[PDB]
Amino acid sequence: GRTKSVTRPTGSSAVITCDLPENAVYTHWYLHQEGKAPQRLLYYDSYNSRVVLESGISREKYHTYASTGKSLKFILENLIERDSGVYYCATWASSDWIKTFAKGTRLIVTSPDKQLADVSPKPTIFLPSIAETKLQKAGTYLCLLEKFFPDIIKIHWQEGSQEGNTMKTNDTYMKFSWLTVESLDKEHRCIVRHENNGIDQEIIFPPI
Amino acid sequence: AQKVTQAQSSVSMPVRKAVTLNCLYETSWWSYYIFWYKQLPSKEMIFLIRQGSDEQNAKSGRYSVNFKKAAKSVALTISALQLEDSAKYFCALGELGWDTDKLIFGKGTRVTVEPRSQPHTKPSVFVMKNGTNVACLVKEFYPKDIRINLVSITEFDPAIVISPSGKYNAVKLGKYEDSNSVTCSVQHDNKTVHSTDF
Amino acid sequence: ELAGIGILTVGSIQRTPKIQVYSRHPAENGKSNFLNCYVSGFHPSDIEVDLLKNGERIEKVEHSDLSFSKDWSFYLLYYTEFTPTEKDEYACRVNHVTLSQPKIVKWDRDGSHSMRYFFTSVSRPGRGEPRFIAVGYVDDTQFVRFDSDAASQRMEPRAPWIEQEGPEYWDGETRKVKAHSQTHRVDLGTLRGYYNQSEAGSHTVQRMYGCDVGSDWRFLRGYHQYAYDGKDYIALKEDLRSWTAADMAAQTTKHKWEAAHVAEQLRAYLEGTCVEWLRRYLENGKETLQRTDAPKTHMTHHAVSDHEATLRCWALSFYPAEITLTWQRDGEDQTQDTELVETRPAGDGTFQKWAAVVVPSGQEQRYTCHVQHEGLPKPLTLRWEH
Numbered sequence: 001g002r003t004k005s006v007t008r009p010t011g012s013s014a015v016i017t018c019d020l021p022e023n024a025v026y027t028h029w030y031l032h033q034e035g036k037a038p039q040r041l042l043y044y045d046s047y048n049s050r051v052v053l054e055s056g057i058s059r060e061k062y063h064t065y066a067s068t069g070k071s072l073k074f075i076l077e078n079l080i081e082r083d084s085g086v087y088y089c090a091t092w093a094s095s096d097w098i099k100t101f102a103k104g105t106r107l108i109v110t111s112p113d114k115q116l117a118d119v120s121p122k123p124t125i126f127l128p129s130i131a132e133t134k135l136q137k138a139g140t141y142l143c144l145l146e147k148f149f150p151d152i153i154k155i156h157w158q159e160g161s162q163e164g165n166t167m168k169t170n171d172t173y174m175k176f177s178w179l180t181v182e183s184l185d186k187e188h189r190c191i192v193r194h195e196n197n198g199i200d201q202e203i204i205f206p207p208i
Numbered sequence: 209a210q211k212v213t214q215a216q217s218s219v220s221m222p223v224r225k226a227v228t229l230n231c232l233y234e235t236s237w238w239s240y241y242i243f244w245y246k247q248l249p250s251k252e253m254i255f256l257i258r259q260g261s262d263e264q265n266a267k268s269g270r271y272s273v274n275f276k277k278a279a280k281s282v283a284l285t286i287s288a289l290q291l292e293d294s295a296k297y298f299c300a301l302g303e304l305g306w307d308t309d310k311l312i313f314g315k316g317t318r319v320t321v322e323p324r325s326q327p328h329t330k331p332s333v334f335v336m337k338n339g340t341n342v343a344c345l346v347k348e349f350y351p352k353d354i355r356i357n358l359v360s361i362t363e364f365d366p367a368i369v370i371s372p373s374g375k376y377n378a379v380k381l382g383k384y385e386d387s388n389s390v391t392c393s394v395q396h397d398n399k400t401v402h403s404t405d406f
Numbered sequence: 407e408l409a410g411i412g413i414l415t416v417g418s419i420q421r422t423p424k425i426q427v428y429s430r431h432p433a434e435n436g437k438s439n440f441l442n443c444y445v446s447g448f449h450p451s452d453i454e455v456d457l458l459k460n461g462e463r464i465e466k467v468e469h470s471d472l473s474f475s476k477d478w479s480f481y482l483l484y485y486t487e488f489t490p491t492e493k494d495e496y497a498c499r500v501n502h503v504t505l506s507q508p509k510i511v512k513w514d515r516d517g518s519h520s521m522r523y524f525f526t527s528v529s530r531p532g533r534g535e536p537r538f539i540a541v542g543y544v545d546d547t548q549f550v551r552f553d554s555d556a557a558s559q560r561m562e563p564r565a566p567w568i569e570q571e572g573p574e575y576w577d578g579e580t581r582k583v584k585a586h587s588q589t590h591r592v593d594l595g596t597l598r599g600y601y602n603q604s605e606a607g608s609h610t611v612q613r614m615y616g617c618d619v620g621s622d623w624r625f626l627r628g629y630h631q632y633a634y635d636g637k638d639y640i641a642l643k644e645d646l647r648s649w650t651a652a653d654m655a656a657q658t659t660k661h662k663w664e665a666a667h668v669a670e671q672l673r674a675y676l677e678g679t680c681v682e683w684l685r686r687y688l689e690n691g692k693e694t695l696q697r698t699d700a701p702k703t704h705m706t707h708h709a710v711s712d713h714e715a716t717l718r719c720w721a722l723s724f725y726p727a728e729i730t731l732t733w734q735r736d737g738e739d740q741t742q743d744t745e746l747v748e749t750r751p752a753g754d755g756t757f758q759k760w761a762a763v764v765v766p767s768g769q770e771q772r773y774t775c776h777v778q779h780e781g782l783p784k785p786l787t788l789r790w791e792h
């Protein structure tokens with residue numbers, strides 16, 4: 001349910017780990033960029049330690065090699081913006097003719113001009129409206145988060161919830177999440193996991 | 209030489225019903241395989257069903273493939289739709305069947321599973337505030353089509369989600385200089401509900 | 407298990423069938439037996455073989471699947487159940503490009519293991535898809551088979567111990583064998599184009615590959631070869647890293663395969679998967695596969711005339727097929743003057759061979775037959791009593 005991601009500046013290098021365990025011979029690496037078709041970048045022959053690239057690809061950009069056990073590793077050099085995407089490893093199954101994919105890894109490269117500064121959650125909590133509380137014996141408190149980077153974010157809530165889609169406030173993002181709660185005297189916590197926090201945020205809610 | 213085209217970009221169907229996702233491919237090979245995968249928002253690429261060129265139409269649980277080798281059409285149908293069926297569905301073409309073979313994918317088609325067809329329910333409309341930000345919250349409505357207008361700095365697209373009762377809830381947030389008196393009005397199912405009504 | 411890697415796209419030296427007509431078992435009138443016509447050594451593969459009883463075609467006739475020898479020539483066994491009598495005469499009738507008329511041959515009543523796959527693709531211009539036949543052996547035992555003209559269009563079992571494989575097995579082998587088929591079909595077209603051969607003519611592409619394990623069951627040797635029209639085209643060298651190509655055309659294939667890493671892929675298959683499935687098959691069929699039957703040998707003596715006779719040294723009911731029969735005369739080896747027949751299948755999993763020399767009368771005792779077979783504790787030396 002959680003997204004694996006790696007964020008690197010352009011010009012830098014990035015290492016992604018194939019989380020896929022028959023110690024099979026051939027493993028294929030795919031790029032999936034938004035609105036495009038997943039495409040194979042190369043594959044690795046683990047018996048001969050050979051990297052085979054698709055046509056049109058620099059011999060100096062990608063590489064892949066084995067590591068501890070069933071973890072294979074993929075490396076990109078001289079990062080540019082174009083390299084952002086979801087990277088998959090996959091291997092044809094022995095049991096049944098299926099190509100198995102491991103959970104992909106999202107690579108965000110950061111543009112040169114990026115002011116890499118406070119890109120943590122920027123909270124703003126909203127208290128129920130009068131009509132709600134008076135008219136149906138329930139209350140909605142809405143935790144709003146803005147000015148955070150990158151879109152990867154998770155929000156929970158405790159003493160089931162829905163949320164919006166993160167959207168692009170200039171070059172940072174926002175996402176809100178609301179609830180309706182007997183538990184109107186109590187108070188609730190909005191629990192936000194974000195990489196640039198490095199611990200989870202716990203946001204307090206008033207009583208209504 | 210080999211290509212995969214998924215014309216539809218998105219598709220929406222209600223619960224318990226069935227949706228059909230079309231796919232057209234181009235291959236020079238005599239015998240080949242077609243695969244249908246499911247991509248989760250967490251990024252898992254899950255295998256769903258495989259169809260051989262020389263096999264009969266594939267059926268595997270709630271998935272079925274209408275194969276037409278003449279037209280080179282391999283449409284996947286998902287019967288008895290569940291809310292967790294909401295994902296991006298990819299059609300992929302194999303080659304000969306070597307362990308060195310790549311899959312040629314199409315761009316995906318997003319499937320969104322809607323609550324069942326039900327009688328129309330008019331919502332309640334509320335305004336929420338924190339300094340300049342004012343959020344209009346619209347509770348328990350059916351159908352999905354609604355226009356939420358806060359009558360007045362910036363406005364974001366509303367969020368519509370499926371409610372635990374099988375209808376919809378929606379929240380629209382914005383920033384307005386005259387925020388303290390701004391209230392919300394919503395046009396839904398040919399009727400208009402104002403926050404001032406409540 | 408067929409390879410799933412290493413298979414990639416790239417005159418007719420005609421040779422006459424040798425023909426043997428024989429019975430599976432020593433013939434005894436009134437006891438049921440099988441009559442065999444073994445035809446071997448021929449190229450190309452279009453052949454017509456009928457068995458005759460008193461001149462008439464026997465209707466119920468089976469044949470083995472097409473396979474071929476190290477010189478790429480083909481062999482087939484035709485056989486039928488039959489009960490011999492004193493009066494009835496049996497024969498085999500064969501027709502082939504290399505024969506001006508059908509040949510009738512009369513019946514005359516008196517340590518290591520390997521897995522190998524053979525593939526033959528025959529273009530049939532104006533007669534449809536190319537014919538494709540794939541057979542798999544463990545040592546000298548066929549266990550699987552595909553024939554493009556058969557009804558199933560599936561890999562099929564030919565040994566009891568492979569019948570227990572799962573449906574994942576038969577689907578996967580059917581996938582990979584059909585991949586081999588389509589590769590060969592592209593090759594027939596391409597190769598024919600390159601040599602500017604007419605589209606009307608039939609041509610053959612042949613492929614053989616496999617692996618040997620020694621008695622420890624660890625990888626010992628691997629092979630992979632490719633012929634066009636019964637002639638060497640390209641072959642993996644014993645190191646499984648480089649290629650030998652004879653033709654000029656085969657050199658473009660050699661560069662293609664060097665750049666595509668075909669030999670590395672084959673090596674990964676031949677040293678790993680091939681050996682592992684060989685071990686699985688050897689275990690699953692150990693009662694049949696891990697046996698040796700020593701040859702049962704004897705000598706016959708037929709008087710040609712008053713001044714010479716034929717001494718024929720027989721080896722019967724042996725397994726595996728590899729065997730050496732040598733004649734010496736006063737300790738001088740007589741290979742050049744020895745009639746030596748091809749090793750031939752009995753039909754029940756054993757094999758048969760004989761070797762004859764013509765000896766002047768009264769000097770039989772100078773001639774020695776020498777038999778070498780793995781199932782023999784020591785090599786045998788036969789001599790004629792009188």
Ligand SMILES: *[C@@H]1O[C@H](CO)[C@@H](O)[C@H](O)[C@H]1NC(C)=O
Pocket residue numbers: 398
């Ligand atoms: C609802 O839409 C119809 C469309 O023909 C219109 O006639 C009707 O007046 C609308 N309802 C109201 C309350 O205006």
